[PDB]
């Protein structure tokens, strides 16, 4: 894949051109490499969804909903 | 959330729906108030006693 992208990327140098076969390998290679680095996230909840009665949460703890809010910032600084 | 370096919080509606048949149920108590009473026996002074 290194190869090949390198190999496109300095042809004009030698004021040559490129063949479709070797763009077909040039992109199966960059697919390949592509495929192994490939990561799909996932979406947490917002933060103010509510916790069914089944998971027993607990009014001891914020577990009454998901977590992730990052509140009370308050201090100094005024005009907040 | 943080929203472009700030701190605005979600919006947090209340539409108390779960209150009204609760105040149905206290002005029925409220209506017929129930308090202790004490029957008599079967005896010549009992009814005295339960006055």
């Keep these: ?80 | 959330t943080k929203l472009d370096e700030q701190f605005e919080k979600y919006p947090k509606f209340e539409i108390n729906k779960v209150a009204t048949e609760l105040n149905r149920i206290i002005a029925e108590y409220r209506n017929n108030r129930i308090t202790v009473k004490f029957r008599p026996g079967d005896r010549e002074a009992s009814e005295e006693l339960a006055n």
């Design chain 1, 1 to 80: 894949a290194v190869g090949y992208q390198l190999l496109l990327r300095m042809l004009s140098d030698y004021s040559l051109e490129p063949t479709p076969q070797v763009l077909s390998n040039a992109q199966r290679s960059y697919d390949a490499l592509m495929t192994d680095t490939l990561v799909v996230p996932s979406m947490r909840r917002r933060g103010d969804f509510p916790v069914g009665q089944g998971n027993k949460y607990d009014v001891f703890t914020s577990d009454r909903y998901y977590p992730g809010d990052l509140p009370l910032i308050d201090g100094d600084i005024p005009n907040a």
